[PDB]
C-alpha cells in the first residue's frame with residue numbers, strides 16, 4: 001500500500017493533464033522484476049480526494065478495473081497504478097478507424113462486466129465515460145478514474161451530493177446509483193460506436209437537459225450495430241426503476257456478442 005520512492009522511477013514527460021495534475025509513465029521495482037506503471041502525481045482538499053480515490057481502488061479486484069499498486073508519499077503525493085499501455089478508449093478509437101464493430105462490441109462488454117462487478121460491490125462510479133476507460137491491448141479494456149466514486153451505504157441504493165454523461169435524476173435530485181451509471185454507460189457506448197466523438201456536439205448542459213425531458217435521445221451513429229443502438233436507448237430510460245441494472249445490460253451484451 002505504501003511504496004518506497006527510491007524503488008519508483010518516472011519519466012520527465014507526462015501522458016496527459018487535467019485539474020488534479022499529471023499522469024506519468026514510470027517503473028516500480030517489485031520483488032525482483034520491474035513493473036511498468038502509470039502514476040497520478042498531485043500538483044489538502046486535493047490530497048484528500050486522492051487518498052479517497054486510492055481507497056476505492058484498494059477494495060476493488062476485477063480484470064476490467066484498473067489495478068492499483070499503491071500510494072507513494074514523496075515530494076508530491078502519488079497514486080501508482082498498473083500501466084494500461086494503449087491508454088484512453090476515445091483518443092484511441094479516434095486514431096484507429098479500422099477497428100471493426102465486433103471489436104467495439106467486445107470492448108464495451110468488458111466495461112459492462114467491469115461495471116456489473118462494481119454494482120455488486122455497491123460502489124458508484126459517477127464518471128463513466130469513454131475517456132475514463134483505458135486499453136491494455138486492442139482487445140483488453142479496463143475502467144479507470146475512481147476520483148468521484150462512492151461506496152454506497154449498506155442501507156441505501158444511492159449517494160446524495162460532467163452533465164452530458166449524467167442521468168436526469170442526477171441533475172434534478174442529485175442522486176447517484178448504479179442505475180445512473182447505466183445511463184453513463186449508454187453514453188459511453190455512443191462514444192465507442194461513434195469512434196471517440198463527443199456526445200451532444202456543441203450543446204450546453206441545459207440544452208442537453210432540455211432535449212432529454214422532451215423524450216429525445218442521440219441518433220444512431222454511422223455504421224453502429226442495430227441491437228447495440230437499441231441498448232443505448234434502453235440504457236437511457238428516463239425512469240430510474242424501469243432502466244436496467246448492469247447485470248441486465250451485461251446479459252444483452254454477452255448474448256449479442258456470441259451472436
Ligand SMILES: Cc1nn(-c2ccnc(Nc3ccc4c(c3)c(Cl)c(C)n4C)n2)cc1CN1CC(O)C1
Nearest residue numbers: 015016023038081082083084085087088131132145
Ligand atoms: C487516473 C488515471 N489513471 N490513468 C492511467 C492508469 C493506467 N494506465 C494509464 N496509461 C495511459 C496511457 C496513455 C495515455 C494515458 C494514460 C493518458 Cl491519460 C493519455 C492522454 N495517454 C496517451 N493511465 C490515467 C488516468 C487519468 N486519465 C483520465 C482518463 O483520461 C485517464
